[PDB]
Amino acid sequence: MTMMDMNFKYCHKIMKKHSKSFSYAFDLLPEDQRKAVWAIYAVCRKIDDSIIQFLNQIKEDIQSIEKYPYEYHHFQSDRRIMMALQHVAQHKNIAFQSFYNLIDTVYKDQHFTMFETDAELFGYCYGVAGTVGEVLTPILSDHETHQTYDVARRLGESLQLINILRDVGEDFENERIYFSKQRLKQYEVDIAEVYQNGVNNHYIDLWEYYAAIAEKDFRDVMDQIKVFSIEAQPIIELAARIYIEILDEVRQANYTLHERVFVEKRKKAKLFHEINSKY
């Protein structure tokens, strides 16, 4: 194990720790591509969880890599992750503005205010996840075009909406509600009231309104999976399918606001079999 291998192993650890779903799928990529995915995911994870001193440090470190990718930097944030990101930047095109969009989104989230409309909720999904899809685009495709970015960005936003749909309860405990005030009012849903008394038809209809949006986006992405490299296609399909299975798991747990549902490992393997066969 070289030092750089140690840096990537650490990125891998962070990714496996936080997303068993994405690590399950992306770890199937060829060595060079999975290593780059671990690094991008690790950087985004650190940014997502930073809260502002460390966040400012991460931004300056990324800015250093962007400006001087081949100079040695004494990184201020997490050296292992930045050394790995820099290694990737030296071999692949990195959409740096997408990392800055993510950082800007996480900063704003300090003075969190509920979203007035679905447009702001979707803007948020772009900021924390559509951005990661854009950064991953060059790793997952041979000849990136605007269409490749568009599909990756859409998948990322769809996965963030599935995430929000799985975590309503836990997010409410953490004083956060992601459904828009417009939609909550239209459907006559009060999250605190539902957290207290259980799901009702108003809440279920609202949750299903967002789930249909995520599912539709998921289908449009699967329809355009060929923008990605032949090796990455089944892997992206697997990651997306495993994640969207969370929606059925939420349904099977009666939309509970009191536990985090999950797709068990044996079910992820079943999806891998089905896709691996199709391919």
163 in a known ligand binding site? yes
Token pair for 68: 């001087």
Which amino acid belongs to residue 274?
A: E
Question: CB pairs under 8 A, 24+ apart, for 199-204?
Answer: 199/254, 199/255, 199/256, 199/257, 203/255, 204/255
In the chain, alpha helices (H) = 3-18, 20-26, 31-49, 53-67, 79-89, 96-108, 118-125, 131-140, 146-166, 168-173, 181-186, 191-197, 201-223, 232-252, 265-278
34 is in an annotated binding site: no
Asked if residue 171 belongs to a known ligand binding site, the reply is no
79 is in an annotated binding site: no
On whether 166 is known to bind a ligand per the annotation, the reply is yes
Taking the C-alpha atoms of residue 138 and residue 94, their distance in angstroms, rounded to an integer, is: 7
167 among annotated binding-site residues:
yes
* Helix ranges restricted to H, 111-200: 118-125, 131-140, 146-166, 168-173, 181-186, 191-197
User: What are the structure tokens assigned to 29, written together?
Assistant: 């990529």
Q: Is 150 annotated as a binding residue?
A: no
Per the structure, the count of domains in the chain is 1
Among 208, 252, 218, residue whose Cα is nearest residue 238 = 218
Q: Is 254 exposed, middle or buried (0-12, 13-18, 19+ CB in 10 A)?
A: exposed
The residues, any chain, with a CB within 8 Å of residue 186's CB and separated by 6 or more, are: none
State phi, psi for 50 to the nearest 5 degrees: -50, -45
Which DSSP state fits 53?
H
261: left (phi over 0), alpha (psi -120 to 50) or beta: beta
- Given a contact cutoff of 8 angstroms between Cβ atoms, the answer to whether 43 and 99 are in contact is yes
Query: Is there a binding annotation on residue 196?
Result: no
> Residue 145: which residues within 8 A CB-CB, separation 6 or more?
227
Ligand-binding site membership of 78 (annotated): no
Task: Judge whether 85 and 65 are in contact, CB under 8 Å.
Answer: yes
41 is in an annotated binding site: yes
118 assigned to a ligand binding site: no
Give the CATH number for residue 121: 1.10.600.10
The approach used to solve this structure was: X-ray
* Domain region containing 57: 1-279
Is 68 annotated as ligand-binding? no
Spell out the residues 6+ positions from residue 45 whose beta carbon is closer than 8 angstroms to its own.
Answer: 14, 15, 18
CA distances from 214 to 26, 145, 156, 271, 275 (A): 21, 24, 10, 19, 20
Cα separation of 266 and 211, whole Å? Answer: 24
